[PDB]
Amino acid sequence: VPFRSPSTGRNVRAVLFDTFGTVVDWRTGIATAVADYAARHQLEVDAVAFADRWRARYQPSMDAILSGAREFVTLDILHRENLDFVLRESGIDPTNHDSGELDELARAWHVLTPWPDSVPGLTAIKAEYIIGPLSNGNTSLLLDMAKNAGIPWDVIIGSDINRKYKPDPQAYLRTAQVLGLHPGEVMLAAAHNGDLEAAHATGLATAFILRPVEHGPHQTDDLAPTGSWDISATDITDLAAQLRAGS
């Protein structure tokens, strides 16, 4: 018997996931690949900090397109442009380096490791619900990641299918509609209250997944829920159990 949302009054039929941070540990993976690049190419970097500088270009690089100032391109292109960007700020010229080797680095985001609860939790949720990402990633990045890591999604509606980024209302609404589901039949699971806010504002069920070290041991934000989401959870294993109790 599915979980009926208190906030939205409908029976959940899809639990879709924010992917970076919520499902996979982006930072460990980005720092890793950066450290490997750094050693191989004789650079002198704080790999961890470099990953943090590369992530901090994510929203601004998306902000340009959200506002209409730039025409939609895929997260893979943004990620690549932001890497150049972060190199130069670190005082390294890109074309001093091989372009295809830097694309490879840029696709490190395709190759990310789940949190230890992710695959087991998602495996259990898949038995009772449609699962899939609800993510700024484009379809091919998300799919590469799902295949590499064995993330068992049923469906992949990438941002490049809606031609929209979160938190643009149409990110949520269009996903719900291509899946054949009223917004309120669709729960968004996310480690980020902001994303949950915007999900709620569209009329989606919400679930908060605490992720205290997404950003390292000195993380500041999203350390608890700042909203009355349907579910608050310590991981996706907890999400599955709470989905099963009902409302």
Q: Which residues contact Cl ion (rule: CB under 5 A)?
A: 18-20, 135-136
Specify the pairing of strand 14-17 against strand 186-190: parallel
Chosen from its own copies, Cl ion, none, partner binding at 146 (C-beta under 5 to 8 Å by type)? its own copies
Q: Which is nearer to Cl ion, 134 or 233 (CB)?
A: 134
What residue spans of the chain are helical by DSSP H? Answer: 26-40, 47-55, 58-66, 75-89, 99-106, 118-128, 139-149, 159-162, 169-178, 193-201, 236-245
User: Within 149-168, which residues bind its own copies (CB under 8 A)?
Assistant: 153-158, 160-161
- Contact between 143 and its own copies by CB under 8 A: the answer reads yes
Decide: 157 and 134 in contact? Cβ < 8 Å.
Answer: yes
Decide: 142 and 174 in contact? Cβ < 8 Å.
Answer: no
CB 92 to Cl ion: min, Å: 27
What count of residues does the chain have? 247
- Report the C-alpha gap between 173 and 158 in whole angstroms: 13
Q: Which class for 89: exposed (0-12), middle (13-18), buried (19 or more C-beta within 10 A)?
A: exposed
Given the rule CB under 8 A, which of 64-72, 80-88, 137-145, 221-229 is the region that contacts its own copies?
137-145
- In the three-class reduction of DSSP (H, G, I as helix; E, B as strand; rest coil), residue 192 is classed as coil
CB 155 to its own copies: min, Å: 5
Chosen from Cl ion, its own copies, none, partner binding at 198 (C-beta under 5 to 8 Å by type)? none
Amino acid identity of residue 199, one-letter, is A
Q: Which two tokens stand for residue 187?
A: 């729960």
Count of residues of this chain found to bind its own copies when the rule CB under 8 A is applied: 22
Per-residue contact flags (x/-) with its own copies for residues 114 to 133, judged by CB under 8 A? ----------------x---
Per CB under 8 A, the list member of 51, 112, 134, 179 interacting with its own copies is 179
- Report the C-alpha gap between 22 and 115 in whole angstroms: 8
Decide: 164 and 197 in contact? Cβ < 8 Å.
Answer: no
Chosen from Cl ion, its own copies, none, partner binding at 28 (C-beta under 5 to 8 Å by type)? none
Chosen from Cl ion, its own copies, none, partner binding at 135 (C-beta under 5 to 8 Å by type)? Cl ion
- Contact between 103 and its own copies by CB under 8 A: the answer reads no
Chosen from Cl ion, its own copies, none, partner binding at 136 (C-beta under 5 to 8 Å by type)? Cl ion
- In the three-class reduction of DSSP (H, G, I as helix; E, B as strand; rest coil), residue 92 is classed as coil
Per CB under 8 A, the list member of 139, 170, 234, 247 interacting with its own copies is 139
> Roughly how many angstroms between the first and final C-alpha of the chain, as a whole number?
10
Task: Point out which residues bind its own copies (CB under 8 A).
Answer: 76, 130, 138-141, 143-144, 146-147, 153-158, 160-161, 178-181
